[PDB]
Write an enzyme that holds these catalytic residues in place. Structure first.
Site, PDB file in Angstrom:
ATOM      1  N   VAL B  11     -51.760  33.657 -42.728  1.00 34.27           N
ATOM      2  CA  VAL B  11     -50.371  34.112 -42.975  1.00 34.27           C
ATOM      3  C   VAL B  11     -49.852  33.281 -44.140  1.00 34.27           C
ATOM      4  CG1 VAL B  11     -48.066  34.228 -41.982  1.00 34.27           C
ATOM      5  CG2 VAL B  11     -50.028  34.876 -40.599  1.00 34.27           C
ATOM      6  N   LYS B  12     -49.906  33.854 -45.351  1.00 38.69           N
ATOM      7  CA  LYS B  12     -49.508  33.215 -46.633  1.00 38.69           C
ATOM      8  C   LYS B  12     -48.155  33.783 -47.109  1.00 38.69           C
ATOM      9  CE  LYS B  12     -53.246  30.580 -47.541  1.00 38.69           C
ATOM     10  NZ  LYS B  12     -53.060  29.117 -47.353  1.00 38.69           N
ATOM     11  N   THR B  13     -47.743  34.950 -46.603  1.00 36.20           N
ATOM     12  CA  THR B  13     -46.595  35.736 -47.118  1.00 36.20           C
ATOM     13  C   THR B  13     -45.957  36.514 -45.973  1.00 36.20           C
ATOM     14  OG1 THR B  13     -47.884  37.741 -47.571  1.00 36.20           O
ATOM     15  CG2 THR B  13     -47.833  36.086 -49.321  1.00 36.20           C
TER      16      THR B  13
ATOM     17  N   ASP D 113     -52.361  27.800 -40.711  1.00 39.77           N
ATOM     18  CA  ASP D 113     -52.061  29.209 -41.108  1.00 39.77           C
ATOM     19  C   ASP D 113     -52.805  30.264 -40.287  1.00 39.77           C
ATOM     20  OD1 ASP D 113     -51.024  28.853 -43.740  1.00 39.77           O
ATOM     21  OD2 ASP D 113     -52.910  29.386 -44.686  1.00 39.77           O
TER      22      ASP D 113
END
Ligand SMILES: [Cl-]
Ligand SMILES: [Cl-]
Lengths: 450, 123, 123, 123, 464
Positions: B11-13, D113
């Protein structure tokens, strides 16, 4: 209700009686019809042969037994052209018909043969075709022509023929499906004419499909297994979830489009029908004469400026009645049809070279074929060329969408995913030399001569 | 070792956040578990700069649309989604420079480009 | 004699046609019979000049929206409704002068004013 | 993400009657904020260990000298090196020995992440 | 989880004669019941017994009974959010008169009409007490016995440590909060106000928001209360459509409680918001026996549905995250000998939360009579529904754009969105919708009559 009835003779004002009989038989099985997962299993490793697991091109003896048939009953009206689709320009001055004839000339010259080239027309296209055909006078090419069936449209409310007379206007009639080949070959005499010349085999194709080229390896594979019917299949991409796919239902291989929709998966059911079909001409003569045809009827509803049913048939349907019917899994270069100006942009691009009347893909092209989605302002060929006079560079393109009034300058390069959306009412002029990569472009921009 | 993609879910964005909060996943013992009915691979989601901040993402997408049957989604400009919106196939939504699009609650969007400027106000 | 309103159900305009073709009524021995669950009176419906001719009304509203729970519907300008649209309470739809509004299929519109421009194109 | 990670260690601990150590590699940007938020996991049977990675000075492109003058020069002129700083940070902080003293022979390494990086006994 | 321990020990901040030991105890008890779920077996509507029709009530009280009444107003609320500094009750409503002014004028009348002296009590908070001590001096010389007390000052909990946000007793106003409206019971008691009222023979208190113009002493409801020895009555009015959010009365078991949508599960909510079958909502007009209140607090049988609120307070740095936990006055109804509710006309529920409410209450729909707003007797329907958008949030903005209140007898429904200015003597009838185009102004000319219309676009009116 049954409701016997029937324009026993319309005017009855030569044969025609023959065609109407074939119609009444489609009408009967229509009233009776209005789907099952019994043994709807995937196709067996035998009934789908890999093109790469074939050898040995056929001889010349065998080639002298082949005829080429092109479906040519379709108008160019969806791409906003009058006359037959086959007469539309594809690239570098050449129409679909021009490319097809150039392909027969090369073959003829390379093997010192004269392969007959047969055009199945309709009352929409026969006559226009008779006139344009004259430009191939002089070239060593045997061009034979025949007309498919002209059936009457059924009024939905009365369920009676739309035409009163035989010379009732062309609105109340329609040419049935691509599956009308069998009855049309026979009733026209074309079947006998080919047999008299020692034709045993036909390779059948849409005039649309640039990549349907005679292949001597699949001609061999056919005869060297006495199979009376081969279907080319290619592989479902995301763009092919629709359209027929091959199934080994029982031991008798059939195919289907229609619950009883887990096959929409590219895994499990992974091949679809190109409509590149090889058949024994002799097999076709008996299945017609023994009346062993009876194909899944397809009913279409339309509105003649009055609501009507059509009722057509499909060439895929027949596969059951053929002495060793299997399918062959071919590369996608053999499935290159042109239904829209989106397809035209692909086919005119730097992705292809013209060689001996064939489209040849750039060997440097990395992935599969780019997906191209032009909006309604590009529907007419005349509009497409007003707005895209020089085809952009599309090696390295994966996905293109263009909506609204968009004009491309010369030598535009498209890479990755590119979406261009002109504002309701507005024009976007994309400057010449623009490099667009992985971007959404939007707004309204005019470029005028200083 | 060559592992299934369920082990690579980063989950980067806020595009990644829309995926991970969707009806495509169930929470079981602190793990994301994908719907076994999901046909293809993981849908591709491309939200524009008006969705970059988490606070902006949740102002505009307070209820996550239904995205089983989605292949591709692009949204650019000021776009708000109502509750129980269904996305199928490829869907592109482009709000005009300066304008808002309010997509009505219950909208079913399939294989379409949506464009313009539309406001939905309390009567 | 002072009769219930079910005895006054005239059809002067395509507004009246939308009512009378809706899920609010069942056909029984050649009579229109109102849903017995219908809470209020008959909903009030105003369609503008783009819905005057029957041929235009059916081009723009091919599938009659679900209007049990509707009190008041007004539509002005070039508006097209998708299949299975649900309308509840008061709904006002005003297309911007010269523009089209395509209401997506499945839209639920309740107690709202909808205004502007929106095109939905086949990809 | 931290909550889901701890919930994953609890399930594992409870399912096999074990106490798997859970180690967080922080940076000067995140260590302290992490010390404070970690307190919410007090009471749950979870062994949470923390360490700080390297704090290197940024090089001025033109002088090719350290951006910081002092040790207490402001946080703008420093940076935490890569994910590859684990090796030197494990060792220099003492965390490597602490794990060895407890009979840890193996580490499974992951981005905070990545929701799908779950302990897999087969691998 | 235990963990408490740390909290209890930390709750010895005690950094002087007057202490708050008492308040912290009441807090630790709310904190304990919080750590439990840190459901409601959806099982019926209220019985014909637990809801009395105001029109099915017996005569007005005597004076004997009136000499037993005290009046309490909730006055902890600020006018921040209508962009006003200090307490909401000090904001001007109409013709020079504040909420406080109207309330006192009501007690002065009443006192003069019946030759009585009804005590008037203000429940303040550390946000409002001091401002109200200063303003209240203007009522010196009129009749009226004015008493004030301060509610509890509880500490905000740090979400991660679950410890007090304040270090000191003199830690700044950011780390503390006044609990709910439900802090009345503990505040009456701990402040001494409960005893002071009992010493004067009060027996009964009528409780109200300062912001509810229509919460007026009703002698019929005072009779009905005493002449059924009911220890708690709740006024209920009828759900219209603008009311779906907020408490409704329920006959859960054989008794009566009430459910706010906060304590309701994810499903069923949709059957609970039906205007048929549930029918009625809480005005916050509550009558109680002062004796009942004294025991319920002393025997520690309070235990009210706790409401937990999350915030982010600021030092030299940025922000930290806290829980509040408050209580609601409605919650207590369980513990009271013959708790029912009465169904009152809507004139008794006329609150002022927004400048939309201010436009109504300043309009030609109302006349000021003995400190009461009295609706035009010719008004056909109910109260008109008014929605103004964000450009009308602050009182200063509302009066810049609507300097002369339009004529709204004959109005049913008004909504205004965007930058809209009304000229003098505008008349609104039926349904009127005004929507300014994104970024633009609409100047509605003076004298405009708008009836059953949608107005949309842009229009500027400039002095030549
Ligand atoms: Cl006090
Ligand atoms: Cl006193």
């Amino acid at each position: 209700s049954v409701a016997a009835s029937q324009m026993r003779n319309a005017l009855n004002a030569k044969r025609f009686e023959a065609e109407m009989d074939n119609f009444f038989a489609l009408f009967r099985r229509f009233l009776n019809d209005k789907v099952n997962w019994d043994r709807i299993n995937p196709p067996a490793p035998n009934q789908v042969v890999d093109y790469n697991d074939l050898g040995a091109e056929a001889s010349v003896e065998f080639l002298n037994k082949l005829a080429v048939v092109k479906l040519n009953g379709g108008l160019g009206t969806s791409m906003g052209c009058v006359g037959p689709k086959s007469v539309i320009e594809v690239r570098e001055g050449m129409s679909f018909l021009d490319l097809s004839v150039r392909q027969i000339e090369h073959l003829n010259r390379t093997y010192n043969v004269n392969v007959p080239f047969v055009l199945m027309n309709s009352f929409n296209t026969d006559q226009d075709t008779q006139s344009i055909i004259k430009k191939y006078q002089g070239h060593n090419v045997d061009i034979i022509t025949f007309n498919q069936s002209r059936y009457p449209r059924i009024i939905k409310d009365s369920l009676l023929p739309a035409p009163k007379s035989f010379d009732a206007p062309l609105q109340d009639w329609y040419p049935p499906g691509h599956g009308d080949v069998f009855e049309s070959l026979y009733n026209s005499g074309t079947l006998d004419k080919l047999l008299e010349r020692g034709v045993e085999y036909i390779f059948l194709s849409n005039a649309d499909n640039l990549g349907a080229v005679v292949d001597l390896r699949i001609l061999q594979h056919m005869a060297d297994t006495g199979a009376e019917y081969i279907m080319e299949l290619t592989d479902k991409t995301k763009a092919d979830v629709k359209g027929g796919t091959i199934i080994d239902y029982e031991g008798k291989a059939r195919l289907l489009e229609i619950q009883v929709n887990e096959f929409k998966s590219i895994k499990k059911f992974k091949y679809f029908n190109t409509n590149n079909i090889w058949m024994s001409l002799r097999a076709i003569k008996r299945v017609v004469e023994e009346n062993e045809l009876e194909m899944e009827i397809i009913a279409n509803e339309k509105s003649i400026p009055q609501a009507i049913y059509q009722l057509e048939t499909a060439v895929g349907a027949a596969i059951r009645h053929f002495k060793n019917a299997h399918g062959v899994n071919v590369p996608r270069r053999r499935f290159l049809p042109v239904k829209t100006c989106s397809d035209l942009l692909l086919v005119k691009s730097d992705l292809y070279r013209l060689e001996h009347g064939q489209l040849v893909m750039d060997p440097n092209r990395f992935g599969g074929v780019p997906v191209i989605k032009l909006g309604s302002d590009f529907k007419k060929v005349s509009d497409f060329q007003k707005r895209i006079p020089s085809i952009p560079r599309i090696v390295e393109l994966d996905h293109l969408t263009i909506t609204g009034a968009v004009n491309l300058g010369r030598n535009v390069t498209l890479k990755g995913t590119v979406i261009i959306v002109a504002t309701e009412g507005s024009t976007i002029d994309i400057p010449p030399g623009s490099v667009l990569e992985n971007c959404v472009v939007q707004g309204s921009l005019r470029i005028l001569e200083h």
